[PDB]
Specification:
About 0% of the residues lie in helices and about 50% in strands. The chain is mainly beta. The longest helix is centred in the middle third of the chain and has 4 residues. It starts with 8 loop residues before the first strand and ends with a strand. Bound molecules: magnesium ion (2 copies).
Length: about 220
């Protein structure tokens, strides 16, 4: 399972979204190298202008690329579910605003790791920080706190994303996450631990389409050795 991740793996991301009736699609391409916890992805909005801020979709757009230190490798659910993959569902609750609900399937298609996502956003304020595009194009580091869910043979996660608002305030986005294997083979059910995530957003100077370039580093931590 983890043997599938010893080198560079091509990644494809495909999202279909509806936020307050704004219909959009995004296509992403890049690669992951779990040895270094490293993701490089470029996303393009193929329907035109993205109707929400790019940073609000970063978490939705492959935790199998996390670097699990050797001493913690028995806690890596994500790779253990491969190649058949996992379903990842989230509720992302924007404080004093709407919510996203997402359902993704993360699995190999041949030697490529694919993240296919459906996103539904409801109850957003017309000129809140999301639909009013008041969020800065940047990102703060965070931890993803993981716990086992033995009855669904899976995991749960909970974490807080803090999106910087252009006036110096912060837009909280509470994340609740559940992952379950697609296949029936055994998976690793971890002790409590977290993923330390650092994300940097940029633009391709040669790209005229609405887009996001993401560099992310993710390292598992939190288990005593
Ligand atoms: Mg290794
Ligand atoms: Mg134990």
């Amino acid at each position: 399972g983890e043997e599938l991740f010893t080198g560079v793996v091509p990644i494809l991301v495909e999202l279909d979204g509806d936020v307050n009736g704004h219909k959009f699609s995004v296509s992403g391409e890049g690669e992951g190298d779990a040895t270094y916890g490293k993701l490089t992805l470029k996303f393009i909005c193929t329907t035109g202008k993205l109707p929400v801020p790019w940073p609000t979709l970063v978490t939705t757009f492959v935790q199998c690329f996390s670097r699990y230190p050797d001493h913690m490798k028995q806690h890596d659910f994500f790779k253990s579910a491969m190649p058949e993959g996992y379903v990842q569902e989230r509720t992302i609750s924007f404080k004093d605003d709407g919510n996203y609900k997402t359902r993704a399937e993360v699995k190999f298609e041949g030697d490529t790791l694919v993240n296919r996502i459906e996103l539904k956003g409801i109850d957003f304020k017309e000129d809140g920080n999301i639909l009013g595009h008041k969020l800065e194009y940047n990102y703060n580091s965070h931890n993803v706190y993981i716990t086992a869910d033995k009855q669904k043979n899976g995991i749960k996660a909970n974490f807080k994303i803090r999106h910087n608002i252009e006036d110096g305030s912060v837009q909280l986005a509470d994340h609740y996450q559940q992952n379950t294997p697609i296949g029936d083979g055994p998976v690793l059910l971890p002790d409590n631990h977290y993923l330390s995530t650092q994300s940097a957003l940029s633009k391709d100077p040669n790209e005229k389409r609405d887009h996001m370039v993401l560099l992310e580093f993710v390292t598992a931590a939190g288990i005593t050795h």
